[PDB]
Design a protein around this ligand. Structure first.
Ligand code: GLU
Ligand code: GLU
Ligand code: GLU
Lengths: 212, 217, 212
């Protein structure tokens, strides 16, 4: 059976195991005709090490496809469109223009953390995005920078009436299923994914988590 | 010097060779240190066969990534977000629901011809994109179904005030660079494209050939 | 019980089920002592996928034996000699040389379709041949290219006085019973067919359906 590394980050991955990426991988696994075990990891870099250490066959959650990651690993066709975005409390912070000199929360080992560090912005790195939302509400942080879809999902729910997404996408990124190089499952994964997109399953799955 | 198959389809590929894909490939190639020679093909299947028979090293144009093509060929990361859309003369056709029982023109060997056939719609598969537009005017066809980006360009230009685009995207498709299986150029192309997006080059190219508001994410 | 895929296409397969291919299959099945269940399909490609999906054990109608099909599937010995033919309204169009720039109607998924596309002729691909004939009479199409035996049958029947078969055979094609690769029924069917061809049964069936 295929060993699949995952990471908790709603609405793509939730535990109690559910979410967009979970339903998607399952539809993909069945599409191919193989069984798989989901192994949770605390962060993206940990999930990546699992790939590099050959502990799992692939990884899926809300993994950004980046040049640096593509350099040492491989990816399937994109499974979702994302991008970095700023979120503030419900001001003096309206865009990236205002970030220098502020404290911004985000998850450790994320493309957001890397982007913030490159811009020399003071960062409060937390293990789970949920803790960043708390830092913002408690005012420990002045803003949050993370993947647009995740922030929007939050604003649409728990964050309702308590936050605001400001500015434009600071960095366009798409999600993908990460794999080791020369993986024999990349093509069957892409193949299945394309089928799901061509038969209407991807759409149904999309609406379930992003279209009420 | 790599042999690169291309197919004329504005505004991605134009010839008087320019266009969005022409500029994108040039950047990717210049960044990788690769030099190339572009070879023109008359249709998508004709371009695919050149790849299949090892007559070229890869191909780029407005090539939809599909399950069927992915089965025998490889694709880079998507280079564009596109999809099929309906176009009629400026009626009784406003959406997919209005196609069955009608005749829709499109290019032979296109994802649009496939979509139409599979949905049991009568399709006039022409060998030349321009002939599809004609078939609509001549009324030989009731409507045309083709890539949205291409129809918009034709509409805002040569077909301005003579045609109209209707309904939403029938099916979303992304374009990619098609490569032979196990191609050693796949990863470096992906790496190049990713950097081009990260440094803004991609963004600038897109805005050069398209209108920001029409982006399909 | 063997599942047999069929497609309605007179005079080989007609509904009222009869026709040359239907009578031939019955004689073959009776001889091999096999019980069969017929399943109708809307197009040749649909019938083919039924074979590929193991949804049927074989297929018989007016199925052309081509390299592309033989590469992915198998065939019995030919059950008929056919070929592509041009039909016009009741002159100028007489060969492929007059088809450039013309609209030629035929069924979607057929060898005629593939032939026309490969020769860069505009082809109106309809799901039902009946539409092809209508398009010709309505002048939407300038001609129709389809299987000679089928067009001849039409011209003698519903088409009498409104159509004309012109020119010679564009491309010779034989019909066969299509099967999945490694099919254990190929040889017995072949054996059965040969016995019918050798004891006069084939001749009788041929005369019954193709005698002027
Ligand atoms: N898309 C982000 C998610 C990071 C996280 O899950 O914390 C990345 O791949 O870096
Ligand atoms: N995006 C279409 C283009 C068809 C064409 O260029 O004719 C495809 O890949 O089929
Ligand atoms: N002999 C044709 C028949 C097509 C049809 O029945 O639609 C073929 O095998 O393609």
């Amino acid at each position: 059976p295929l060993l699949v590394a995952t990471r908790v980050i709603p609405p793509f991955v939730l535990s109690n195991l559910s979410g967009f990426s979970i339903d998607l991988w399952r539809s993909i696994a069945t599409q191919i005709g193989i069984e798989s075990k989901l192994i949770e990891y605390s962060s993206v870099p940990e999930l990546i090490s699992a790939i590099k250490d050959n502990k799992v066959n692939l990884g899926i959650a809300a993994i950004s496809i980046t040049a640096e990651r593509e350099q040492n690993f491989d990816f399937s066709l994109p499974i979702f469109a994302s991008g970095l975005q700023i979120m503030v409390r419900n001001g003096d912070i309206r865009s990236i223009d205002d970030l220098p000199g502020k404290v911004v929360a985000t998850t450790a080992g994320s493309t957001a953390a890397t982007y913030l560090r490159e811009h020399h912005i003071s960062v409060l790195e937390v293990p789970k995005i949920e803790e960043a939302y708390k830092a913002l509400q408690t005012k420990k942080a002045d803003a949050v920078v993370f993947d647009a879809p995740v922030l929007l999902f939050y604003a649409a729910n728990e964050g309702k009436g308590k936050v605001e997404i400001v500015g434009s996408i600071l960095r366009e990124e798409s999600y993908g299923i990460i794999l080791p190089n020369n993986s024999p499952y990349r093509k069957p994964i892409n193949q299945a994914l394309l089928n799901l997109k061509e038969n209407g399953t991807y759409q149904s799955l999309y609406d379930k988590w992003f279209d009420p």
